[PDB]
Structure formats: structure tokens, C-alpha cells
């Protein structure tokens, strides 16, 4: 795992389902272009509570 194989890419969410690209292996940071803002990751068992 290193930069040179990394990727920028935009996503299409649809309130959830946003699907994983075929080419995917492992995810570093993920955010918005709007205002700069970072997501974080968790389990179903928590998001469901949310």
C-alpha cells in the first residue's frame, strides 16, 4: 500500500446504498469537497442505533 496507486474519485450515494467500485482494495480518507469534512467508519451495530 502506497500513494502512487491511490485514487481520487467522486461518489453517487443515494441515501445509503452507495456502491463499492470493482477496483477497490482498501480505503484511506474519505470526505466532501464541500467545506472539507472527514467521515469516519463504524459497524452496522452502531449506525443502526443512530
Amino acid at each position: 500500500r502506497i500513494p502512487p496507486l491511490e485514487k481520487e474519485v467522486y461518489l453517487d450515494i443515494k441515501d445509503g446504498v452507495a456502491y463499492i467500485p470493482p477496483d477497490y482494495l482498501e480505503a484511506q480518507w474519505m470526505m466532501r469537497a464541500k467545506d472539507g469534512t472527514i467521515f469516519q467508519v463504524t459497524s452496522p451495530e452502531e449506525i443502526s442505533y443512530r
Binding site: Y10, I20, P21, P22
Partner: protein, 87 residues
Amino acid sequence: IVYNNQAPDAVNNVGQFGATEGSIGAYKQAAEYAADSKYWALLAESKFGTIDDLIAEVERLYQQGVLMKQDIEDLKQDFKDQDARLM
């Protein structure tokens, strides 16, 4: 920076989500059918776009204008003829 809009070409030779040699046909056929549906929806706006705006407008617009013209002409002719003959 990018979108995932391109078409399915290859299979994951590493990575445990997505395409395999036994599923690529599904991806490709799905893409073909989606593009065909779009072809339809777009040609449809067109027929429909076209049909509507075009003919509906030329029909109604000139019929109405020409029939108002009809009223005017008939009225004028009649009045003039009558009054003048009376003279």
C-alpha cells in the same frame, strides 16, 4: 476528482468485491441495456420534445390567427358592400 462512469472492461485479479470471470457478462449486459434505455428516453424527449413544441404550436397558433382573420374579413366585406350599395 473522478466519477465511476466508464464501462466494465476487466475483472478483479485482486480484490474481493465486484467482478469475476464468471460475472463479467452480467456487468456488460447491464451496461448495454441501460444505454439502450437511455437511447429510448432521449429519442423520446426528441419525438415528444419535437411533436409537442413543433407541430402543436404551428397548428394551433396559425389556425387561431387565421380564424380571427376570417371573422375580420367577413365582417368588413359584408359591412362595406351593404353600406356602399345603400349609397
